[PDB]
Amino acid sequence: MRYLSKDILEEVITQRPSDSYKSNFGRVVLIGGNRQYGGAIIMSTEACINSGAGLTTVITDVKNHGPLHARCPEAMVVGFEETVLLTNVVEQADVILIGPGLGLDATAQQILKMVLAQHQKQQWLIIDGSAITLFSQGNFSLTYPEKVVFTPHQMEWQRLSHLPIEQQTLANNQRQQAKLGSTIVLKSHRTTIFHAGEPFQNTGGNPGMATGGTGDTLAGIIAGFLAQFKPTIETIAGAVYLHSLIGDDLAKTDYVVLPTKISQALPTYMKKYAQP
Amino acid sequence: MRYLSKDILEEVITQRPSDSYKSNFGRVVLIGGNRQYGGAIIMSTEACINSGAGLTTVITDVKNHGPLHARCPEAMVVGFEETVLLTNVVEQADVILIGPGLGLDATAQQILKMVLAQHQKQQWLIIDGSAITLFSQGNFSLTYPEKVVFTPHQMEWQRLSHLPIEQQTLANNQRQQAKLGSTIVLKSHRTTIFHAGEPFQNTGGNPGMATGGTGDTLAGIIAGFLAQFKPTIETIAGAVYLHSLIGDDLAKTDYVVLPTKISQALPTYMKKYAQP
Amino acid sequence: MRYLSKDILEEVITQRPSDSYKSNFGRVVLIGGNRQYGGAIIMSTEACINSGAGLTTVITDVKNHGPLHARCPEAMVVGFEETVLLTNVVEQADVILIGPGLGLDATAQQILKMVLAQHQKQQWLIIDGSAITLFSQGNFSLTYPEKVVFTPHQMEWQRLSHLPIEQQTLANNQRQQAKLGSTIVLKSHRTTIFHAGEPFQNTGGNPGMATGGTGDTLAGIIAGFLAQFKPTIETIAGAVYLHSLIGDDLAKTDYVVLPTKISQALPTYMKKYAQP
Amino acid sequence: MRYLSKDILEEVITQRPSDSYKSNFGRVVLIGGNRQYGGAIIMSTEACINSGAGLTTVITDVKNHGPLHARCPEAMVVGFEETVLLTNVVEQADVILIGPGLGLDATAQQILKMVLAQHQKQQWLIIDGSAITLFSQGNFSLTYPEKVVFTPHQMEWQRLSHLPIEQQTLANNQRQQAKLGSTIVLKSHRTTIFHAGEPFQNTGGNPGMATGGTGDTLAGIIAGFLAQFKPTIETIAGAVYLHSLIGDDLAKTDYVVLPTKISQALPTYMKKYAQP
């Protein structure tokens, strides 16, 4: 087990080459935000953009496009009803995040089915929140599981793995990871990442981050990191570590840590660690 | 009578345990914002989120969802027409605030009737603004009055209690409180809180806070405090005191104190007082 | 002629009494913002709220309510189609500002006609921008002209007064003011205010404020000042002077002075001058 | 070839005369933002306003007016369906920018055709992004090519000029410029501007600006500069240089440079260089 520290950040966050263009920094499609939870996908989008993703496209209810553009004009917006366009943006994506604010309805199930069906070996797929629940209910078989990332909290991991909370032990968690062949970012008070290699144990987090939207922000950072950096699980560990490092720093002054504040801090923190 | 000072804040605002999750910090449903006064419910929402409430859901006119999400992406939004969903979020709520920007129409009366009908002993109910007027017109009998909180200004207290302004004396106020068996946050230039125990007398406030939205902010802070802290009337007194402490501090530099500024200050002030 | 200096601010901007309530600080209705120029009325609203107006209601195209609430949640919003409500808010207003972003169409003409018809002796009426043009085209006779304020630039003053630019001399300007019996805030590189008494000559202004929205901000400050302060023309001169004082200060660092920045500075500047 | 340095800024950015009015500082119409890419036109608008343009009007999908006004209340908004009004604002424009977020559909083609058809000798026309692609597909003949500015990246320049990337050499670029008789702002890691005179070579830029919206911001700065400053190609070089100077400064602290941050810095940077 590797216990995370700033060295993960110096490892993962590379200085950009002088002659770089947007697409070098990845195309991300974020999918979520039903009519009640549009804010969730807006928080993931803000995190993704602030993290350095080259191009961010958001598939979300058209209700949410207006407030999303008020806060995140850098994002392209596609509604759930724009079937041809949404299919196209997903095909062209380097990274797909599905789940923030997604909910559990039929359109949600169809989009997940479509994403999974088309998933290609070169694409990262992050399945978060209610998308983990849908995936668990639908008996899918992943074509390229090594490129799928699940970000469950402990209750979603019970749904996915059948491990009850008390049995969510290092060895049992690893065995269920192995069964899937995917990366499991098991979110908790101290988040642990299970994969083909040596698990990563996060060392930060505070209860001031126990507020709505914190996981949406993390998912957006993970997507942005996978858009830009080496396609190894260390990159995901870097995202996880940075999310809580900024949170822990904010918590020194702020009783609750608003997720937008974590996103807004990303450019200055990343510059600090970018490998010289 | 207890005269409020910072000691109320050290008493009420506890350090969160290292292993805390969102729901530990309460589920709040805020209800209000008709088509003209949507800003009111947005200001209550901003205050509630900034105060540390775990999860905030807003039932308000669908007209208001867009600007609410532009400012408060952490909130779930439900429209007045989503009868089944709104009923469900109210049932699941730990704290319900009804009133900011609510107005006086039939839909408003029906929602209040529904809230009151379902109110359960474990839930806090805050009845604010035009909801106090509706309650006063409707001859309701509270099932669990000890868990209801009324936040009238002196004119709404006349409606509720029949005490004319000049007779709103400590002893008469207490007698009318006793008749209800509910908490009365009697808002004035120096706010006083009447309950089963020894009244609380606030010691701050300034005329720079005499601007629209100040009471909406307070109501959101009260809801957020009741979401997180001990279920005693001291928690409400803490909210009241903190609202005016921040106001009074802002008023040192600002001629008028914009309510959003009070909300934005909550995380740094709360950290200062959180009981070590 | 009184040449304006900070002494106008110490004269006009009074310390609020300890026991003050919102309505003491006036009810303002701002009318304007057609479908193309909604931003204009949003800038006037931001200025009015920041200036300290007790209660601000905005009558503007329903298209504009969403972005207005994203920036100004303190405002009540009424659409042009809400005939009964808009009539009611105008009747109850202490100060009416009509004109920012209003345009020149029939609905615009009808609203102005309605405002003028109902104008009462206790109400301030500010006629700004395209409302000056409409007024000039419509052959109205003011019932209480001493309580009307026109805020023309030099071309609108030609429309209103028939004075060509070159003949807009102190003596001719005064004579045309006298014909109306209203206050004329003649906006220019150095704004001059004509009334029954000794004209006021502003002494600030810079070309960095020569940007769209500057006059909308001024009109909102004038409305907010008349809402709160003595009903004498000195109060209007205070608004004018403060607008350019903040502008001139911002212009020291900013090549162009964005009008929102002037509005955002009002609370700290007003505190500085409020008469001890 | 002139290698750009701050001296271009001292040359181009003049101190405004004491007696200046908005229209002296130019009328700009920005055209773009389809239903998916509305954020692009919002970023160009923010840049144009912050740059000092007198009056900014935006022709964009009505979907985008709400978030645009939330961020940029200084702009007039016109929808693509308001045929008469949009025609009128274009006729009256001093500077037209067409392209940010425009996309490639028929309405887009018609608007470009209309703009080109009416282009008058006194107007600057900037053709950016997907408008370069449309122009390249449509076999147009420019009536006043000396007043047209193309802002291609290297792939759009291949479309326009048929020069493949490897043949985009100084001499070949100049020859293709000469064929058009227009200004070519050839965007790259080090942007070069070709015109009738001696090319301008930009000397800044960093890979932190390799993020969506950076080119939209530049286009808005170019439009704002042409609105205000001398009608020579040096003015365009000033815009280009300032865009990257601010970017390079932000990149010292920020890993990625968010385009909104460049726009927000314009007033303070321009004041620094404005020719004393």
Curated annotation (Swiss-Prot), chains A, B, C, D:
Subunit structure of this chain's protein: Homotetramer.
Catalysed reactions, semicolon-separated: (6S)-NADHX + ADP = AMP + phosphate + NADH + H(+); (6S)-NADPHX + ADP = AMP + phosphate + NADPH + H(+)
Protein name: ADP-dependent (S)-NAD(P)H-hydrate dehydratase
SUPFAM superfamilies, alphabetized: Ribokinase-like
GO biological process, one term: metabolite repair
Annotated InterPro entries: Carbohydrate_kinase_pred_CS, CARKD, Ribokinase-like
Required cofactor names: Mg(2+)
Enzyme Commission (EC) number: 4.2.1.136
Domain YjeF C-terminal intervals: 5-273
Gene name, Swiss-Prot/TrEMBL: nnrD
Main enzyme class: lyase
Keyword Transferase: no
PANTHER family named among the record's database cross-references: ATP-DEPENDENT (S)-NAD(P)H-HYDRATE DEHYDRATASE, ATP-DEPENDENT (S)-NAD(P)H-HYDRATE DEHYDRATASE FAMILY MEMBER
Gene Ontology molecular function: ADP-dependent NAD(P)H-hydrate dehydratase activity; ATP binding; NAD(P)HX epimerase activity
Family statement: Belongs to the NnrD/CARKD family.
Species of origin: Enterococcus faecalis (strain ATCC 700802 / V583)
Residues reported to bind AMP: G215
Binding of (6S)-NADPHX, residues: A40, G103, H153, D216
Keywords noted in UniProt: ATP-binding, Lyase, NAD, NADP, Nucleotide-binding
Main function: Catalyzes the dehydration of the S-form of NAD(P)HX at the expense of ADP, which is converted to AMP. Together with NAD(P)HX epimerase, which catalyzes the epimerization of the S- and R-forms, the enzyme allows the repair of both epimers of NAD(P)HX, a damaged form of NAD(P)H that is a result of enzymatic or heat-dependent hydration.
Keyword Disulfide bond tagged: no
